[PDB]
Design a protein around this nucleic acid. Structure first.
Length: 234
RNA sequence: GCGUUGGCCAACGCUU
RNA sequence: GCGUUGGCCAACGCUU
């Protein structure tokens, strides 16, 4: 077990959206053994982020069960989180050990009525990547919750004239009925990003959106994974 | 916000 | 002249 550790040395200056530092969260990516030890920054949306590989536990033997789990999750990172070195990349937490609960949680793989309403918990949208459930018809889309607009509801004026309200937008286009008209809205930014990081409207309805098991922060961390691995392998 | 073609500037690379 | 990233406008397409 090695840890792919992350800190932003040089954050983005006041010139031009906020900031999202990888060290504000403890959960990260790491690399399993059976491999020889390599030698010892990627430039993100959150600014310049320096990267450090360290050894954590050498000479550990892990169960074939847990090995299957870590490899399954490895492929889940690369086929599912991104779309396209070393053995399995894995989640680490309290940097301490391996997170088996996290992996098992991910591996766990919607009726709203007036009699059966939709409940809005704010926490669920705080660190979140979401999907419109309404249009997975081609290659489901994933968005970080950029903002939560608490002064807004689905009955708010739609940004385009052809529609007066959001509820009306989703009703006319997607034939979508909302059981919560009091829910706040979510500004979102797209998760699909650049592959080589080595060199330097959009409002959604919580009720129409599924939440992704990979927290937005860790997503943002994962987007580094290829650019890291490019010169690690090389 | 994204995409796409389309000009109008920046910057290093080719090219001359 | 080309290429490449990078902003700054045009236009239809997605999206909201």
């Amino acid at each position: 077990l090695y840890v792919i550790g992350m800190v932003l040395t040089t954050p983005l200056p006041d010139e031009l959206r906020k900031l999202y530092p990888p060290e504000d969260t403890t959960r990260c990516f790491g690399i399993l053994t059976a491999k020889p030890i390599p030698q010892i920054p990627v430039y993100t949306r959150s600014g310049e982020v320096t990267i450090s590989i360290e050894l954590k536990k050498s000479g550990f033997m892990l169960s074939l069960q847990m090995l299957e789990l870590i490899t399954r999750l490895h492929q889940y990172i690369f086929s599912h989180i991104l779309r396209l070195s070393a053995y399995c990349v894995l989640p680490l937490n309290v940097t301490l050990d391996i997170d088996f609960k996290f992996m098992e949680d991910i591996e766990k793989s919607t009726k709203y009525t007036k009699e059966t309403p939709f409940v809005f918990k704010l926490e669920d949208y705080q660190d979140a990547v979401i999907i419109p459930r309404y249009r997975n018809f081609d290659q489901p889309h994933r968005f970080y919750v950029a903002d939560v607009y608490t002064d807004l509801t689905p009955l708010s004026k739609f940004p385009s004239p052809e529609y007066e309200t959001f509820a009306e937008y989703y009703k006319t286009k997607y034939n979508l009925d909302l059981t919560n008209l009091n829910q706040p809205l979510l500004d979102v930014d797209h998760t699909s990003s650049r592959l080589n990081l080595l060199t330097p409207k959009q409002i959604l309805v919580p009720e129409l959106c599924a939440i992704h098991p990979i927290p937005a922060s860790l997503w943002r961390k994962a987007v580094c994974l290829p650019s890291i691995l490019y010169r690690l392998h090389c």
